[PDB]
Write an enzyme that holds these catalytic residues in place. Structure first.
Site, PDB file in Angstrom:
ATOM      1  N   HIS B  41       2.358   1.189   5.828  1.00 55.39           N
ATOM      2  CA  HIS B  41       3.127   1.764   4.718  1.00 55.39           C
ATOM      3  C   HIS B  41       3.715   3.143   5.030  1.00 55.39           C
ATOM      4  O   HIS B  41       4.508   3.622   4.217  1.00 55.39           O
ATOM      5  CB  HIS B  41       2.392   1.760   3.374  1.00 55.39           C
ATOM      6  CG  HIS B  41       1.300   2.771   3.248  1.00 55.39           C
ATOM      7  ND1 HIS B  41      -0.026   2.418   3.427  1.00 55.39           N
ATOM      8  CD2 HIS B  41       1.364   4.094   2.935  1.00 55.39           C
ATOM      9  CE1 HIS B  41      -0.726   3.538   3.243  1.00 55.39           C
ATOM     10  NE2 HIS B  41       0.064   4.570   2.942  1.00 55.39           N
ATOM     11  N   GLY B 143      -2.199  11.398   1.313  1.00 52.09           N
ATOM     12  CA  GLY B 143      -2.057  11.855   2.693  1.00 52.09           C
ATOM     13  C   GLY B 143      -3.259  11.525   3.566  1.00 52.09           C
ATOM     14  O   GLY B 143      -3.199  11.715   4.785  1.00 52.09           O
ATOM     15  N   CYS B 145      -4.348   8.523   4.107  1.00 53.01           N
ATOM     16  CA  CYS B 145      -4.107   7.237   4.757  1.00 53.01           C
ATOM     17  C   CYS B 145      -4.055   7.362   6.252  1.00 53.01           C
ATOM     18  O   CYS B 145      -3.518   8.348   6.776  1.00 53.01           O
ATOM     19  CB  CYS B 145      -2.828   6.602   4.220  1.00 53.01           C
ATOM     20  SG  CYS B 145      -2.734   6.594   2.419  1.00 53.01           S
TER      21      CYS B 145
END
Ligand SMILES: O=C(Cc1cccc(Cl)c1)Nc1cncc2ccccc12
Ligand SMILES: O=C(Cc1cccc(Cl)c1)Nc1cncc2ccccc12
Lengths: 304, 304
Positions: B41, B143, B145
């Site tokens: 993503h 953030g 991820c």
């Protein structure tokens, strides 16, 4: 979202860990620049530990008796000195992995991460608080001596603790990096009274603010209190008295949530007087005091 | 003595963290050898996240659109590919700090350490369990991820988790290092049912053994039970049914303490039926299920 008992990343400290052996005793040392720091009881045998005369035991040792090994590489010891309860072994090589660092003496109620080590090898990392009575409730086994506690501010490691001893009660005692014990403790195998401990009130309030930020709100009530009234309740429940300096440090969390500090004190007051009623806050069934107001903001808003 | 929610030392993983930017999205990547792994993503905008067509979004991207930065140094991307929900960015330089590593898919109930990161920079480390419903109760902000979960066996890092998403319930979902989600989750901004969760029975029993080893013994009783009887109580209290494979893994702790596994089940049975009565076990006022039997032995007997 979520709130965990988070430790600082330990990499910068792992690079400093060495094994120190003197005679038949092995423990951990901290190699910073060209100096290795370790508990002075590395010079003792078990027969010496009832009441060691450290100055006499050290006079029997020469630089070549201190074996320092950094993983596989052997360090050459060119000087030794005792400073309070630590030994400083001057080595001929500066640690290439020395981070930017400081030695600090933390205050009771402050938190830090511990890198538990055995034989100079890191085993695990956990976060804890320095108790108001200057003990730490760590997790340490024989050979953990010399493991250190620290905080990190971007690239700077502030070392605050070196582990020395486990008291007969199963709690831990140690020194700052200049070898001064936190609390009344001495490096001897004797039963030693740790003071009456208290719960770190400002940290419980910080953690209640972390709960509100993370959606755990059931304990919020329609009440308020005063510092005076709250402190009568803190006295009854063996909590540290709250001061204006504590309310001031809680300012950012109060602004974040819009909950006045004294209103949160009234929530804490009701939880002390009534218990949790079989409910939980941030996955805990007791009031947590190992997160300072700085820890909560760092965890909830983000800092690397 | 002492028992803490201990994480593995994070140094080996800190050396692998990088920042990955694509368009206006920045997250963390894991740089191992000449490959950087990150959530797919990173190629999305917020308008794309309701239901991204990842294959089409990726076709619009070239190697030069993926900006990878390892602290200060910029990595040159020479290939890109999507494998399930991860992107693999081939870089022209092997990470000099690549530890010995493996990619493993952990089972529900197993534990691991998480190195929470933001912008490729480590912020903190904590230990957690993969829930029986394949969620993790982490501590993560926007953030985070690309932060990873791992275990360490001496010098080998077994990576088991890459963080992808926070569900509307505030719990976390992610993938193994081949990009397969744990659980039913998909990388879309939709409300997604996490299954009915249960308490990891074998871990609670392991933690009761850790309590006995550490001196917390008040919950031990004069009773015993059977797997059948205990499992009726496990059913009522939403605990995982105990099997002989669980009893077998608890063998070492049973031998250490001399407490038969079914006798410890009878202690757990009484704690489930009667509660803690305002008492604590290893500083907890609830039954803890984030320590496996391996974790307890590693912590109580020592491994580096
Ligand atoms: O307490 C010591 C040695 C010692 C004795 C007396 C005084 C001093 Cl200064 C040091 N070691 C240990 C430190 N932590 C945890 C331990 C767990 C089990 C056994 C020893 C443990
Ligand atoms: O959830 C996401 C982004 C996203 C959205 C939908 C699907 C997917 Cl795959 C990823 N980011 C975050 C991950 N952890 C914690 C977070 C806390 C606050 C905000 C975002 C957080």
């Amino acid at each position: 979202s979520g709130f965990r008992k988070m430790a600082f990343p330990s990499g910068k400290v792992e690079g400093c860990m060495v094994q120190v052996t003197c005679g038949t005793t092995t423990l951990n040392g901290l190699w910073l620049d060209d100096v290795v720091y370790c508990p002075r009881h590395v010079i003792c045998t078990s027969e010496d530990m009832l009441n060691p005369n450290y100055e006499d035991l050290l006079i029997r040792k020469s630089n070549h008796n201190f074996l320092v090994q950094a993983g596989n590489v052997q360090l050459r010891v060119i000087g030794h000195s005792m400073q309070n309860c630590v030994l400083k072994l001057k080595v001929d090589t500066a640690n290439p992995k020395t981070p930017k660092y400081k030695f600090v003496r933390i205050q009771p109620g402050q938190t830090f991460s511990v890198l538990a080590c055995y034989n100079g090898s890191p085993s695990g990392v956990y976060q804890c608080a320095m108790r108001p009575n200057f003990t730490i409730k760590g997790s340490f086994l024989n050979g953990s001596c010399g493991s250190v506690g620290f905080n990190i501010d971007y690239d700077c490691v502030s070392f605050c603790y070196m582990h020395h001893m486990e008291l007969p009660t199963g709690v831990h005692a140690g020194t700052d990096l200049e070898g001064n014990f936190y609390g009344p403790f001495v490096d001897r195998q004797t039963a030693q009274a740790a003071g009456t401990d208290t719960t770190i009130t400002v940290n419980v309030l910080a953690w209640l603010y972390a709960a509100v930020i993370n959606g755990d709100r059931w304990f919020l009530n329609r009440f308020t209190t005063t510092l005076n009234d709250f402190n009568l309740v803190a006295m009854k429940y063996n909590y540290e008295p709250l001061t204006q300096d504590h309310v001031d440090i809680l300012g950012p969390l109060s602004a974040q949530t819009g909950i006045a500090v004294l209103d949160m004190c009234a929530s804490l007051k009701e939880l002390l007087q009534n218990g949790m009623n079989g409910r939980t806050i941030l996955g805990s069934a007791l009031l947590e005091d190992e997160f300072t107001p700085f820890d909560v903001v760092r965890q909830c808003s983000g800092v690397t």
